[model samples]
Target chain A: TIYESTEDKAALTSVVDLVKLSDQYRQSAILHYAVADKLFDLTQTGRTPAEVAASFGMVEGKAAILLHALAALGLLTKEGDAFRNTALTERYLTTTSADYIGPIVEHQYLQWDNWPRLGEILRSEKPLAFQQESRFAHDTRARDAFNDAMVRLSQPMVDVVSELGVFARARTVIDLAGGHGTYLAQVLRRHPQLTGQIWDLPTTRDAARKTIHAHDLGGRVEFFEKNLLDARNFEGGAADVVMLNDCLHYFDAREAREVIGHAAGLVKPGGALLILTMTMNDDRVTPALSADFSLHMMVNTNHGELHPTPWIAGVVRDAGLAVGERSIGRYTLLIGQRSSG
Target chain B: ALTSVVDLVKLSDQYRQSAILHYAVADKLFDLTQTGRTPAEVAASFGMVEGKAAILLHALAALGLLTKEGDAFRNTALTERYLTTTSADYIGPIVEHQYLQWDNWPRLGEILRSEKPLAFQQESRFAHDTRARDAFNDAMVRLSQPMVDVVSELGVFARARTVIDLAGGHGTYLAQVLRRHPQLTGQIWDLPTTRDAARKTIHAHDLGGRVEFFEKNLLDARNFEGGAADVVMLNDCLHYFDAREAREVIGHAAGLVKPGGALLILTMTMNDDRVTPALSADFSLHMMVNTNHGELHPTPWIAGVVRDAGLAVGERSIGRYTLLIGQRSSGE
Candidate 1:
């Protein structure tokens, strides 16, 4: 979804052409990441082709082919099979670099392995090829890794979400399924006396405890273990502020309403319930990344999906909380107050 | 255009040859795309990066082989007509086949020094690379398939009861004739694949019992043991031998044919001018690339060879395919 300069485009065109020359050679995204991981290790001190290949366990000739193919397209610069990362590669392909998107790029590659075959699956009415790793199939460590990745990954959209805050008087807040409680720390730092609770899995609770302990915010924050998918997990009417942070995208309307209704009952009478997400346009036709995420949900879970504005709004209204003022930034936030109807 | 040509010359001088080589490779590969495959699928198969794949695919779109819809690729109208495999006028396989020759092209100097065309790629000949073969075959069929109907209509096969389809693999061109004339029995004469495929194809059309196969190595005369035949056909097998060798092969066929029987020789023939857009003038460049002795000759070249060998040559055209009828005369 990112566009570089026109020359970058031209260079990329060249790379694709050389791709044909090597007897139509192809690599999986995992292979690409594996190569990049080595390149990063090699270039840690200073860049060299031997170092790059050493980092990846690739021989000079084969490495030269890949490096040359990439370099010809402006992805790298080769001085006699010794390669230095190009500006694009240095920025986007390395882990140490600030704009590093290696994991996200890897994710795109995995998606590519499946998405193009979707039409075939639809036509043939076949079961998914990799139904096991469908979406939420990650082990605890891998799940934490993805969530840790997501913290940095989805941070670009944080400013977009931060713009929606009208939390002038809000004090304590619960961040539902928040990973490592870093953003909750942000909320606590913003409102000094604000106590926070992170309701997440046991692994997340452990991680959140360490994170909160590291930040010396243990007194202000509490960590609880709970599966957000489980109904009646959270206690009724416990806190003044409750936050469903990036959790709604994983549920359909009926379940979302149940979650909201329960959260509404849990909130102290007039306090606000904050819901954060990359909101979609009403007809859900525009903002393609969000729409694509909806498809990701289709592959990832059985009941989880992305909903449009009115559908989300209707759920909040039906929860006995009058949906109030909305805020928009990187993500849109919908707030509701307890209404005596 | 001439001034632009000067600019091109100057530009070429300024850039490194390697850079230009890569550009030319890109220009050729991306512009020749497939119908069902994605740019990513194509790129991954060729070990290309994502951005590079997108750019190359887009460049191809700019050149008009494909059209991009959102993120998907569709064949252009021009490409759909002549570049797609299913198109009646498909030429994509030919372009693909030509593109594959780029590797050995740079080694031509060494090849010339050794006085052998394949000296640059020594181990290349012994290797049975199905990829190269299939790719080339795909190209050949596309080029030949559209012309089949055009040329099949050029001559009548009704007089012949059985045909010796010399190296006529699969007998697809002959299959069309069999479909038209149900009573005509045909024997596919070539390699085992061709024989098996011809048997399957003919039987698929319910022409099974009538149509038969005669597996023979065309180079070895003893293998031509299909007994006496009404018509001995050579669709494109003639150009592979020397004029002397060609006559010998035709003479063998002529000896096999009954008196007043016909020998059919079909091939790309050079025009009267010998240059003005003759198919072989264009096809000859590829002929040398593919073959040893095969060259497209003028009809007179063939006519003289046939007449000297005691058979009369009568020429007629069916589109690009020429029907070189050699008959064993009752009185000559």
Candidate 2:
């Protein structure tokens, strides 16, 4: 018999929770997908499950279960039969909100595809097949999804960039590999006199253009459609500040150092070079998020790897620049000034 | 970017923990950790590389399932009670059983897009596999062990001379009941594979003759022709079918109760509001993905089904499993 007598009810309950951990995450996925599809938007003013199901063209029973599951995740709250989005959901998941992160969360399905192959990647030192090819070169649908996700992710950083004061002393700024011009647009808005250029793949030019136009900075913020792998494309350009926002991990250590070197060269004498990327600890083990992100890079990109903060600082110094220290949340911004020579 | 992003990442880490737990159980790491041992020693003992063993132990410690002191690691209270295979309430068997369920989660997007049933429905583990059947029955027996105390607390068996356990796989409940009331005899009605399991359990308890075996699927009405008893209990069974089929099963089970006889429907029931009390809601999704008709029903729905069967319904709770007691009124 599987049943044996025991008096530890709390232990049994905890066991149930432990065993259902996988199911819980899967539930979160479904909930996230529903939010991405704007299912929660239908219940913005609060509505019964029947109303929501009808409005969304879903089965009544299925919709009720999804609503309950969302409530369970604290993403939604129920008042009697009507369900409403929680504060966090309303703030970040809704389409109309400035803090909308639905696209970022929705992109998790792509990560889900890469996670299962992590063991093999770790063992073989080779990523999945998809990682070997460029998403933009082959899969236009995936490329668009990734592009949209990056724009949504950069929303919070807009506030961070505006406060950085890098644009105050600069006449022009170059946002290197900026997928969307949102970051530079926010900066250019804060400092009207400063003109900026966003250098990225030509494939991303459309999204960048849309963002620049949305912020009414199309005339001031120009697009430099060039691959970041080739630094010669920006040889003639001079900027007081050159920014690389969350893009360095796309290359291994050697390429990242080269990219930074080239980026440092683009900065005018005494001009600032700003790098915003996830930096791991010296041991590369603590601060679990960065460690997991390293594994993420391993499984999702061919050469992408997370470098330690100290290592990154050393690389910047090797490029004949003086490093500055400051962090905006987990993403450390490594500031370097080109030597007056 | 605050707690929300961290929270999502941690929730995503649940998959990592699940995988670790699965491997730990398969490799019997809990047993190895019974006595404090260094990570290297653990690796040597389990025939694993030291680095992998250390990583697994550290991850488990991070998850709060294990504690590391100095160079030695030991199980936490929760793991000791529910993870060690030798423990009375060991749930490692169940964790291992759901490995397939966890593996199928990657297909969640495809499943939702196609509106197709989950892998469990496409290919049942217990229906065709003997190992899966035994593992499932064994896991249920372990799960229901604590419920016996709750069931006995009701003292419902005092007047029940003839009891029937509908779809009772291991007959653990019946065995416990017959132990409490030596004069009461019980019958476990289930599938052929389950009947064999129940027979073993009954024999193990030395109640082989006292508990009769009835092999038949409860979904079929022919199985209940002579099932009339003073007490008819459906312990954690209502979720095997959908609302309509559940109502039909309830009606049939109710008929097995003679006039004034008690009918017990035990399940993980939801609240009428259907939103609060999170675990049941989670279970409802678990059912949606795993079974054809199974779902967590609300209290009112269960009561409604009982009323439809011409019985009076009253709610009862014994720890986590909620019980709905229906009775055929003496005057009816």
Highest-TM-score candidate = 2
- Over A1-341, each residue of candidate 1 has an lDDT whose tens digit, in order, gives 22101111122133223323222212222134333344543543445545555555544323433443344334455554356665555665567777665544344333333433332332222235443234434544444555555665445444443443534466667778786666676667666757888887664666687678876886999777777767668655377678776778656566777777777666776677777765666534334334444545543444435666567767778776778645444256678786433
Query: For residue B244, what is the lDDT in candidate 1?
Result: 65
Among these predictions, the greatest lDDT belongs to: 2
Instruction: Look at candidate 1 and tell me the lDDT of residue A110.
Output: 38
lDDT of 2 at B19: 53
Model 1 chain A poorest ten-residue lDDT run: A3-12
Question: Considering only chain B, what TM-score does candidate 2 achieve?
Answer: 0.86
TM-score of chain A of each: 0.74, 0.83
lDDT of 2 by residue, B8-78 (tens): 53453345435545666766778888888887898778665454455456556655677777789898898
Q: Is the docking of candidate 1 incorrect, acceptable, medium or high quality?
A: incorrect
Categorize the docking of model 2: acceptable
Query: After aligning candidate 1 to the native by TM-score, how far in Å is the CA of A326 from where it should be?
Result: 5.4
True contacts kept of each: 0.00, 0.20
Candidate 1 C-alpha lDDT tens digits along B173-280:
666666766667777767653444566567767877777777676667887554676677777667556456676777666766656777778877665433323335
Note the residue pairs that clash in candidate 2. Answer: A2-B141, A2-B142, A3-B141, A3-B142
